[PDB]
Design a protein around this ligand. Structure first.
Ligand SMILES: OC[C@H]1O[C@H](O)[C@H](O)[C@@H](O)[C@H]1O
Ligand SMILES: *[C@@H]1O[C@H](CO)[C@H](O)[C@H](O)[C@H]1O
Ligand SMILES: *[C@H]1O[C@H](CO)[C@H](O)[C@H](O)[C@H]1O
Ligand SMILES: *[C@H]1O[C@H](CO)[C@H](O)[C@H](O)[C@H]1O
Ligand SMILES: *[C@H]1O[C@H](CO)[C@H](O)[C@H](O)[C@H]1O
Ligand SMILES: *[C@H]1O[C@H](CO)[C@H](O)[C@H](O)[C@H]1O
Ligand SMILES: *[C@H]1O[C@H](CO)[C@H](O)[C@H](O)[C@H]1O
Ligand SMILES: *[C@H]1O[C@H](CO)[C@H](O)[C@H](O)[C@H]1O
Ligand SMILES: OC[C@@H]1O[C@@H](O)[C@H](O)[C@H]1O
Lengths: 146, 34
């Protein structure tokens, strides 16, 4: 039997995979059963380990979801938000000091998640039950007298 | 004579390989000014 690759892992083939592998540091796999076709990015698939969004970051290889940059606290009352320079990164840098800003990020944001599959049907109705033994016939009367 | 019994299931399948830790936290604290 075949086993589906767990969350945070992807199969290294579209059809006949030999071993699931962990998603890279900059990516994340939300689903169960991720597979990596070879058409475009190597570690990317329709359900595969997606790269973390612009704001969000993750560093652990096999992870379900990324996390947002934490608010940097340099001392008293200094909560400065942080962002990422590139599309997928495992380190979140200050948003003030990044070179390419939110202004120049020309990537277009990917579609929403396609809907969730229907449920399993009920158990089918068993075929009918066997009719009982049919009845017997009449019995031969005793020989008429002579 | 009646039929024989069924088999027992397989065990519990293996667990995914435990992930590694994280980076070594930072690099250069503060390079000297000019
Ligand atoms: O109800 C008795 C039933 O038994 C069996 C037969 O198929 C039927 O014709 C009927 O005789
Ligand atoms: C009638 O037959 C079915 C089998 O389809 C089932 O055994 C029932 O228990 C029986 O009453
Ligand atoms: C799509 O929209 C997001 C905001 O959620 C962001 O601007 C990305 O740069 C874009 O790809
Ligand atoms: C499934 O639906 C979503 C939108 O809901 C998206 O278009 C995907 O590309 C599609 O596969
Ligand atoms: C079932 O599937 C969709 C993705 O196709 C989504 O994860 C839903 O949250 C889930 O219920
Ligand atoms: C029992 O259930 C299945 C569901 O797949 C089928 O539709 C019929 O309802 C019956 O065979
Ligand atoms: C005669 O009637 C039926 C058959 O015709 C059955 O065998 C009885 O046992 C017998 O008496
Ligand atoms: C003797 O018995 C048989 C049974 O069918 C028949 O009635 C004759 O008429 C009787 O004499
Ligand atoms: O298996 C035996 C059968 O079960 C039922 C009937 O009564 C009997 O002949």
């Amino acid at each position: 039997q075949c086993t589906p690759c767990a969350a945070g892992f992807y199969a290294n083939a579209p059809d006949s995979a030999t071993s699931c592998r962990a998603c890279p540091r900059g990516y994340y796999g939300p689903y169960s059963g991720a597979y990596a076709d070879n058409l475009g990015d190597e570690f990317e698939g329709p359900r595969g380990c997606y790269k973390c969004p612009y704001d969000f970051f993750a560093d652990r290889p096999g992870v379900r979801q990324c996390t947002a940059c934490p608010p940097l606290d340099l001392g008293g009352g200094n909560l400065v938000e942080q962002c990422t320079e590139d599309l997928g990164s495992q380190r979140c840098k200050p948003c003030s000091l990044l070179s390419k800003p939110k202004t120049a990020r020309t990537e277009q944001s990917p579609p929403p998640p396609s809907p969730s599959p229907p449920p399993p049907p009920p158990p089918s109705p068993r075929p009918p039950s066997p009719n009982p033994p049919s009845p017997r016939p009449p019995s031969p009367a005793p020989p008429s007298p002579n | 004579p009646p039929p024989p019994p069924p088999p027992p299931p397989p065990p519990g399948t293996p667990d995914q390989p435990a992930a590694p830790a994280a980076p070594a936290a930072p690099a250069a604290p503060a390079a000297p000014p000019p």
